[PDB]
Amino acid sequence: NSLLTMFRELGPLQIEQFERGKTIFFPGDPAERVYLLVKGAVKLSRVYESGEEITVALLRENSVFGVLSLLTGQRSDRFYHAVAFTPVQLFSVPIEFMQKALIERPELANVMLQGLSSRILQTEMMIETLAHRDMGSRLVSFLLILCRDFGIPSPDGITIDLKLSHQAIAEAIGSTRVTVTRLLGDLRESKLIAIHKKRITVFNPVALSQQFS
């Protein structure tokens, strides 16, 4: 919105490309900077001794993140794993620059607070979907969020502009891949979605959304 305008100051800041799959920060990296994602989808996650990961966030275009750095800076380290879930473009300021920025250009402070406020709300939406007791509805709820966060109008309805694997979904809705496959199958044979080259299209979100609630 205007976060873009804000972040593009603070130097002329250069964009950063991240190829799909490439990690933006690792657990253990010092929380020394703040990020505005400009294009693409970033996936925050928690990584276990086993090597398995659990998805804590799918950040969407225009999301501020790396927020821990506003608490701590170097003081403490990252404990989540930020990864380019699609090809990604972002800005990235070292935190101390932010302070000095906000001090002098207050206008940004408000915009910043709105950014974070918006994130609190989106996380809570995720809690809500995760709170569903049956997986069928956990899934549909999750898809509906993606429909709004990454949706693109298409002839058959709304298409989730994301390469979603069954495993990525499983790690998002706290499920096994096998169960995601079965559920996605059921949705398809019920003429509610279609998947083409890993992109899901939901035909009638407003319907699906009311069909469950």
Add this chain to the structure above:
Amino acid sequence: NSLLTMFRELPLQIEQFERGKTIFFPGDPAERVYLLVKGAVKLSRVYESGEEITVALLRENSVFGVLSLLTGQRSDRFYHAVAFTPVQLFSVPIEFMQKALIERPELANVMLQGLSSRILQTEMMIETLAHRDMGSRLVSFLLILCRDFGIPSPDGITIDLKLSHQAIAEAIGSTRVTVTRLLGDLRESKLIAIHKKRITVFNPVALSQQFS
């Protein structure tokens, strides 16, 4: 920490809320921002059926009513904020915040830290909710409460909260019946004790590693 100092400007009076009394309802305009000073506030989502699902258990010193920073009165509340314990808080109308932040920048940073902190806490909740078996969903949840509302006691750490089986079920996305069974198991296994609705976990550092 210092949010307290910040909010106490704007001389603002505290507000008491009796346990169970609602702080805002779905449909109330997002007219103001809140700092909870003492007690526990429960944000939830309310369904046609009347049933509710817990989205947050806010903890002493949490900023909340955050939607008002996006929209002000222009859009309405869609969550239900309720005093889960007796509560004391401050409550500024948003436009007063803007003017505050404009003039006392120092607060802006402090504010951003408050919201940052909230993003992280919510993500912790996502994590517990992500556990595939309820046993571990429960334990993970209890461990959060141990840190958010824990008080040292002789037998270990006591969660300073009146937690019913139904409140728990609404927090970890479970049926009441299952919460009763799970809590039973935890007790018969000498891992927690519950008195007069307060849960005490004997060895959090152990329980926390016992599962991970």
